[PDB]
Design a protein around this ligand. Sequence first.
Ligand SMILES: [Zn+2]
Ligand SMILES: [Zn+2]
Lengths: 284, 284
Amino acid sequence: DFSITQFVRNLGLEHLMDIFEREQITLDVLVEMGHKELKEIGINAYGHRHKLIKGVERLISGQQGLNPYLTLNTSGSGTILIDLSPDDKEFQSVEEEMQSTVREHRDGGHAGGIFNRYNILKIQKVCNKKLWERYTHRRKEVSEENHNHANERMLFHGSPFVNAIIHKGFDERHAYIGGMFGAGIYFAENSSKSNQYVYGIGGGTGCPVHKDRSCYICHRQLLFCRVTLGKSFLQFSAMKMAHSPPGHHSVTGRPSVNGLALAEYVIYRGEQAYPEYLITYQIM
Amino acid sequence: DFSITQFVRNLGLEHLMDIFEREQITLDVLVEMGHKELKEIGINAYGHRHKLIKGVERLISGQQGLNPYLTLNTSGSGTILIDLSPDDKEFQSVEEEMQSTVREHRDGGHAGGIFNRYNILKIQKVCNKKLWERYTHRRKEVSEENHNHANERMLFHGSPFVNAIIHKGFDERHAYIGGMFGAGIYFAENSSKSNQYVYGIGGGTGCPVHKDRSCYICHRQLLFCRVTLGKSFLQFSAMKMAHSPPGHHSVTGRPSVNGLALAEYVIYRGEQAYPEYLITYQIM
Ligand SMILES: [Zn+2]
Ligand SMILES: [Zn+2]
């Protein structure tokens, strides 16, 4: 509140403050205004606008080493969830992908429970500008390699930390070597495959409210994410691997005659995935 | 040649012709010039520039139904080939993708010849703005369906008509029901499979110079193309088609017992593929 007051006072233009107070002009707003905008709010004299613009230039550009522009302008960031309408084709296609990828697992519903299909409560698009910029920059880097192709896919992700993911993004620092391909972040083509990890590894102890892994009452959350796989390394046997193998950007576990029953995808960099859709559902 | 003269004479500005002759200004160039550009070439009077600009507006905007702009802007279109440097990362990535995807087929190199590695002579980027905009518009159309996911792959294509493809683009009107999945354009993830079709189905009659399908001497050509698959219908046995099945944008033929040996992809609309790279090579 007092920052713009100091800024204007240093210029000797405090007599303009009664305008800035009425238009709710803060310093983060002032740093984005030129001659046109300043004339709109009532700064009529050219000299006053010139002084204000030169002060803004001296602050933002003259002291860029301090990044004053980033201590300002912080507001407006964050995650917005936009609810899809069941009558739209986007919701219907997401639900079709969710339902049609269910499969019979080797374990008798021990981790994910027993069901044939889902009841989808709502689907939301996740919008976060900083996370999206991180993802697109990494995608550009990966596609500069691998002959101008990002090998981008849309894959399911199940975790008890979905809320943290949709606000801070994917992070490989939360992965550990206990995984089947090591310390990477895992994704699957099958929604039922990801449903096993919603309550932790191996299903954990079930829902917090029933302690039941097949609880048909408590809600569940999955993510449907854009994953940049780049040049993927195909593997059929388990590895305790910390990073992608040399020359590759991801690992693909393939279902052979023995071992894996379904395809699996692993990325060792959090910036290579973006959680586009958040799906809330129950198992039938 | 003469159109600029008629345009200038109709405005009563024929005395300006000597300038337009010196500066090689044609009508297609004139329609793109404003006050700044006209002032640059020495048309100093405001009235003359005003008359020229309003005449251009009356022509291009006043007769939009006859599309004079399309007639004037024909020049500059067409394909160009940009040679890749063997020392560049892109060339090496394409070469590795081609070499590492060689497989031994069910036949003993009857269609594509007998070999284990390629001798890549050159790789060329194909640039054509019209075809690129067509492909990008189709990609946006498909992405609006299939929950904001194009499902874009990089795949190999081989045919005796690549020269027509790089200038006119992929065209489904040349496809016929004789294919195993009907009248579509076929792509493969394995270079050696696409190599089988360079001279025609089953290798045709071999290279023109020798009529030899396993010729090690004559140059062969393949395309490495962006293919938009969207929602792909999985298939394991042959069934003929004129178009993709309802709700789907492409067909994926999968390996199976008594079925295919290697994966195949089929599209039924030409604008869903773009021939990004042209590769020419020798069979070793
Ligand atoms: Zn419960
Ligand atoms: Zn030959």
